[PDB]
Amino acid sequence: DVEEAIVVHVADTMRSGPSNSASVPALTAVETGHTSQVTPSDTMQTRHVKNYHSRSESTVENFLGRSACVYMEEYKTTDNDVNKKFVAWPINTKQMVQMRRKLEMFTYLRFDMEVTFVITSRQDPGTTLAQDMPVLTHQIMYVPPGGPIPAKVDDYAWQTSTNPSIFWTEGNAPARMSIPFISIGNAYSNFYDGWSNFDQRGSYGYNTLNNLGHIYVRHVSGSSPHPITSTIRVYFKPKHTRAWVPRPPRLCQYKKAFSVDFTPTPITDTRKDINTVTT
């Protein structure tokens, strides 16, 4: 009622002696699609070894359970261009290369998400910088698909009555939250080999299934006499992860944020000849 109470280790090595028999563990046939399960004990004399190594750090939960940057953008407190005083990002995971490649090792994923925001500000250079400005405040707004979108820093849409938002003041700890599994399907799909229209026309690829919404950011009411620039960084961290259908890691460099397009690349590096073994 008050307190409820809730290791694997790799396989050991068994002692093996001399052998002379008709069994041939070493000989197999890869044509069957079967990976051989032989062990050193089956082809040479071995001693008894008790291993205590564990594969704890290789689990998908730990492999994908690290915060990684997915987007950064800059916005200014005051400027002549209205569009440059706030950000508007359509959520996707293909913008940054490292986390993209980590994710695309699997075809389908299902996880909760933990989002962290890091915001920093700096004064823009100019001929006159002497001013006194109190601490700034920022708003992060999440708009599910189909909702109204703000067109300027002081629009009515920023008065969220149903859209979740966060107000954060500089100098404190970074903002953070949790997000559940918000896919319409039974799992997220990194790849989609299909079209949007039923007659095989229109958009092609993963771009068709990206309908996660938008994120907007602004200075709440800060408007300094001299311009100030702020940068926001978004970090994603999967939780409670499950993965299906592994696929080989990518070899070619990425070139588009919403396409698989690539340039052909050599399989690997070369060496002097097939016998060269020295440095």
Binding site: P18, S19, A26, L27, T43
Partner: protein, 251 residues
Amino acid sequence: SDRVRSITLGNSTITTQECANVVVGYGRWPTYLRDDEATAEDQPTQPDVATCRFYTLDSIKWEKGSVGWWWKFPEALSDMGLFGQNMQYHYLGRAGYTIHVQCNASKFHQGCLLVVCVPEAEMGGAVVGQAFSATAMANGDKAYEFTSATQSDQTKVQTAIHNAGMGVGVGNLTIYPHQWINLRTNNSATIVMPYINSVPMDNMFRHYNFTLMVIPFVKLDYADTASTYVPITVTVAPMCAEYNGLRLAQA
């Protein structure tokens, strides 16, 4: 299937996929010396896996005109791994052997080899009387060739093939532990030789325990192919080796 065999000694393995049975000496498997038969008093040394392993004894070519070859043991392994070092540093030695001979050819070749281990294969000189040095019949792992015609050089052994260099009919060597390599059927031969001698131990440099002979009874033949020769390879692994009487090296 009984045509597949696998042998594991030490850190080395031999696999054959088309082979005959295994011949075991005179029905006796190699074993260590017992307490009631030993004569030397000091403790023996038993390197085990360091010495009991397969060693590949160089290679030779089988031509249409080949007549035969022989190797003398344990001299053939005198400079091979730690077996040679233990031979050099010790006064006495004792070990059995596993001999594996590889020879493979297509289904369109023909030929037959006799593989036989001859204990105490004392040989006679080319010229009656006289004498020869210990280089006419053993110089390491190199193979020595028999001759079709009668030998004439006085510095070497009588290599006439049909007498096997021992004054006996070559056709009667079937009495010793032996096996045949017939290209229609098999591509390897395996013999396990126990330690055979009149004393419990002996010096491995002074005395040749046994001699391995490979003799083509049916000469090689083929037609219209790019393969001009059929290599033959010999592999040997000491078994249950133990040594005694440490001293300065060399021998």
